[PDB]
Design a protein around this ligand. Structure first.
Ligand SMILES: [Mg+2]
Ligand SMILES: [Mg+2]
Ligand SMILES: [Mg+2]
Ligand SMILES: [Mg+2]
Ligand SMILES: [Mg+2]
Lengths: 166, 245, 100, 217
RNA sequence: AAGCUCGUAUCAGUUUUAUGAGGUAAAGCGAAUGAUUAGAGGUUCCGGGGUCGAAAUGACCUUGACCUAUUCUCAAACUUUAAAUAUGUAAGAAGUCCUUGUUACUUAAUUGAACGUGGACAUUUGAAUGAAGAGCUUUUAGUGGGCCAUUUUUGGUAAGC
RNA sequence: GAGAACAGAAAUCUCCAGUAGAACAAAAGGGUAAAAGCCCCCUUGAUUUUGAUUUUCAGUGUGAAUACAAACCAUGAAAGU
């Protein structure tokens, strides 16, 4: 009755090896794709093989909640032709994938932007997950209400009519 | 009490630059052929010797690479141990110096406000504002010694804005005049400094250079406060960084 | 970050004004451009002086110390996008409109 | 110098304002500048002192400040209706070496972005500072119109190899008492900037940009 | 040494009862800390500096970074428990209880806090044993090289070190 | 630890475990988790006047520290500090 396995978060992130015009480009791409303004993220530490110093921006990401989440998810499954591979599924019950050549997402073929890639990650839950997110009287989830791998795989196999190979 | 000869090399500076140069030269000539053992110290090291012949030839080798002063001491066991205390002149290269007045007048009427430019068996100073050098010997130093104004830890960075010249060079050094700013307020203020220096042939506009900033400095020095106020500059530039990758 | 490593500095354009505006009547017999470039570079390429010949027997455009020293040495010794305009034309010739 | 009963400068300003537009009603070129020569100081032997002493009173309204910046300050400069520049535009400016020595002459000053000024040091190469046009930075939240007003009203005393520093201290337009306040402020700034606070200053002269023979200072 | 104010005080190189504090001996490490020592390569994972250099597609150097696929091993500068010996305080008259006076402090207040007026409580007045009188002041001498013994210890193979 | 295009010890995102094994300028020891750590907002109490107390101790000085009083302020919704 309450246990439903609905969509909690759809997170879209684009990671860039450079720190040039490409980050502003992917920022405009994410602001055109999602209906919200994105957030650029600073590098944690320094690498010098990726050519990365700390405190300078690397990647862009945005989070989507609501019906636009399952809209973007249906578009991504249409790109992935409704196939996952029995990896890409966490034990905790989240799942994601990655998309090369983002022109097949309603994005046009503008050369002022060009070609990018994306990562989509879907966080799943059940009702009553406020108990771990509130401030006063925080608690946990009992060991029958948690979303697990087999629950997510069976529920979102039977809906979206997808396939999980191997 | 088992060696009979000890040589104790010291330098009373936190950053022992001349001492590390000396250690590289001892390791690159291998003058440590006949050392019994080596004792570390806070400001140097002690070499041990079975007879005093290798010790006195170590003194002979050290008397021609570095500006030192050595003294001899005699021990008794009841046959006599010998101890050789060697002190290096505690002024390293690229250090800022205010000279005593009589020494500065007798050493070519050079300015007192100088920079240590080369260290050899003697030591060499140079005026950065007008290209002019001088040679001070270890014995005339140790006759009445003095200390340095600033060492290489308070070197602040500078961003070169513009270059000029005056035409005069003395070989390897083109005495020019450059306008410069600090990289802690280049994007904050409109504060520019005008420095007549010897980094003219080596520097071009837009890069970073190390220097001493005298206008932000609490100096407690009688040689410094016996100067004049208008004839001491604000910035003394020393060296360019120039990192390739 | 942005356009950073454009290399508009480090001896290319700045600090190239150490000239000396003296009486300029240097010793100069024959120092012209073609024979100067040939006698300078017969094995590689080189970078030339600002304005140095012996046409008027006067030269003061050796604005550096090594420049003035080499000028005094040859005084004291007697001596003597852009590919797009073809690429797009080749591509338009390759795109014959008959075969489409 | 220590100030010397400024009624002489008052009569000099009145004679200058009766010279301009009351004996020669010329076209609108009002700039009553103050020229000051210093005495008893060696340029090489003494320190080359400088400061800026920006008085909010303005006299040079027509100025050119090609705001070099990014995209947000480019939109802010288009809002403030001043000549701006772009990043690729400045890249082409550093590409063509002869264009920089000309753009330093078609402009009158500059005002940079606290995000691109630590590059004008090297990207926009030398002779900009030799023509004394190093750009002053403007932040991401300060007013661009106010910064342009300040960069049009900011006066700066710098010690060159010559002892003859002149500054566009006023206009010949109006406001005798405000002009007297401007002359007092400029004399105070020069006297405090010099080494001896009174003795070094020798020559003071007013000229309303017309080679007028009325200094009387 | 000179005394002075007084007359059995409320004191003690001690015990008892009550109540605190400690981290050594012993235990235990294997319950978390379990170690020096001679310890092989892996370079654009770091690189400390030192010398030159009209400077950067910048050459010349060596301790070391990091033990990488090695554990048993145990502590005066490790911890869970924790003696004995030594240590602070209290065992009342300057006390307890009842009643109600002062204040410019404190309370929402007629509440408190501190100091009191009046009244009640001596055969034991609140554990033991002792008490050579108790308390207080002024002034001044010599000394300021120490050594030995049992026990507990630190540095030196060790000594009458 | 389990997941996500390029991604490969190690770049960005998501979840679970995590009594502190991190951080708090520097030596070592102590202390700290809706904080003393990290990220933001406002500020100048790092102010004025002088007494008392603790450590070293002769219960002198110097240094450092503790708790009030009389003013003026900061911060916070506030108690407070
Ligand atoms: Mg034990
Ligand atoms: Mg009573
Ligand atoms: Mg005595
Ligand atoms: Mg005696
Ligand atoms: Mg004290």
């Amino acid at each position: 009755p309450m246990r439903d396995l609905k969509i909690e978060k759809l997170v879209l992130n684009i990671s860039v090896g450079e720190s040039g015009d490409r980050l502003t480009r992917a920022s405009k791409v994410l602001e055109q794709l999602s209906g919200q303004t994105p957030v650029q993220s600073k590098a944690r530490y320094t690498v010098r093989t990726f050519g990365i110093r700390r405190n300078e921006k690397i990647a862009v990401h945005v989070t989507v909640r609501g019906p636009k989440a399952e809209e973007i998810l249906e578009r991504g499954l249409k790109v992935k032709e409704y196939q996952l591979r029995d990896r890409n599924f966490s034990a905790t019950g989240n799942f994601g994938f990655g998309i090369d050549e983002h022109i097949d997402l309603g994005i046009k073929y503008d050369p002022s932007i060009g070609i990018f890639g994306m990562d989509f990650y879907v966080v799943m839950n059940r009702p009553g997950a406020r108990v771990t997110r509130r401030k006063r009287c925080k608690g946990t989830v009992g060991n029958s209400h948690k979303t697990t791998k087999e629950d997510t795989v069976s529920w979102f196999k039977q809906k979206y009519d997808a396939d999980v190979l191997d | 009490n088992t060696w009979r000869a000890t040589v104790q090399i010291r330098q009373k500076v936190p950053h022992k630059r001349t001492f590390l140069f000396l250690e590289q030269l001892i390791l690159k000539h291998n003058a440590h052929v006949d050392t019994i053992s080596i004792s570390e110290a806070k400001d140097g090291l002690d070499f041990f010797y079975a007879q005093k012949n290798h010790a006195v030839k170590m003194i002979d080798f050290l008397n021609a690479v570095v500006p030192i002063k050595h003294k001899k001491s005699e021990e008794l066991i009841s046959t006599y141990k010998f101890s050789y205390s060697v002190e290096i002149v505690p002024i390293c290269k690229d250090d800022l110096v205010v000279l005593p007045k009589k020494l500065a007048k007798s050493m070519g009427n050079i300015s007192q406000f100088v920079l240590c430019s080369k260290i050899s068996n003697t030591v060499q100073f140079m005026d950065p504002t007008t290209l002019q050098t001088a040679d001070l010997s270890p014995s005339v130093y140790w006759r009445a010694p003095f200390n340095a104004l600033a060492d290489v830890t308070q070197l602040v960075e500078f961003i070169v804005l513009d270059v000029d010249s005056t035409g005069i060079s003395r070989g390897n050094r083109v005495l020019a005049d450059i306008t410069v700013a600090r990289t802690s307020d280049l994007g904050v203020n409109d504060q520019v400094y005008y420095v007549r220096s010897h980094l003219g042939g080596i520097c071009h506009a837009g890069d970073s250079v190390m220097g001493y900033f005298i206008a932000n400095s609490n100096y407690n020095s009688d040689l410094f406060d016996g100067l004049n106020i208008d004839y001491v500059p604000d910035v003394v530039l020393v060296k360019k960084l120039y990192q390739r990758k | 970050g942005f356009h950073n490593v454009g290399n508009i500095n480090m001896m290319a354009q700045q600090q190239m004004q150490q000239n000396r505006i003296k009486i300029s009547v240097r010793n100069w017999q024959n120092a012209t451009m073609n024979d100067l470039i040939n006698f300078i570079s017969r094995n590689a390429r080189v970078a030339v002086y600002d304005a140095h010949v012996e046409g008027p027997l006067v030269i003061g455009y050796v604005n550096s110390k090594a420049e003035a020293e080499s000028l005094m040495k040859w005084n004291g010794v007697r001596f003597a996008s852009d590919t797009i305009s073809f690429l797009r034309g080749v591509l338009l010739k390759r795109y014959d409109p008959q075969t489409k | 110098m220590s100030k010397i009963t400024s009624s002489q400068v008052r009569e000099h300003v009145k004679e200058l304002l009766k010279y301009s537009n009351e004996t020669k009603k010329r076209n609108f070129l009002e700039t009553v500048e103050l020229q000051v020569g210093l005495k008893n100081y060696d340029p090489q032997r003494d320190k080359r002192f400088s400061g800026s002493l920006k008085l909010p009173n303005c006299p040079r309204p027509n100025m050119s400040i090609c705001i070099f910046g990014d995209a947000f300050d480019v939109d802010r400069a288009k809002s403030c209706g001043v000549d701006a520049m772009s990043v690729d535009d400045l890249k082409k400016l550093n590409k063509n070496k002869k264009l920089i020595k000309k753009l330093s002459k078609k402009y009158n000053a500059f005002i940079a972005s606290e995000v691109l000024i630590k590059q004008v040091p090297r990207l926009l190469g030398p002779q900009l500072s030799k023509a004394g046009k190093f750009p002053t930075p403007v932040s991401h939240n300060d007013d661009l119109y106010g910064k342009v007003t300040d960069v049009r009203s900011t006066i700066k005393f710098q010690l060159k190899k010559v002892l003859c520093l002149a500054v566009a201290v006023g206009n010949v337009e109006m406001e005798e008492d405000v002009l007297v306040n401007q002359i007092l402020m400029s004399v105070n700034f020069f006297v405090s900037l010099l080494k001896k606070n009174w003795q070094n200053v020798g020559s003071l002269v007013v000229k309303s940009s017309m080679g007028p023979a009325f200094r009387l200072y």
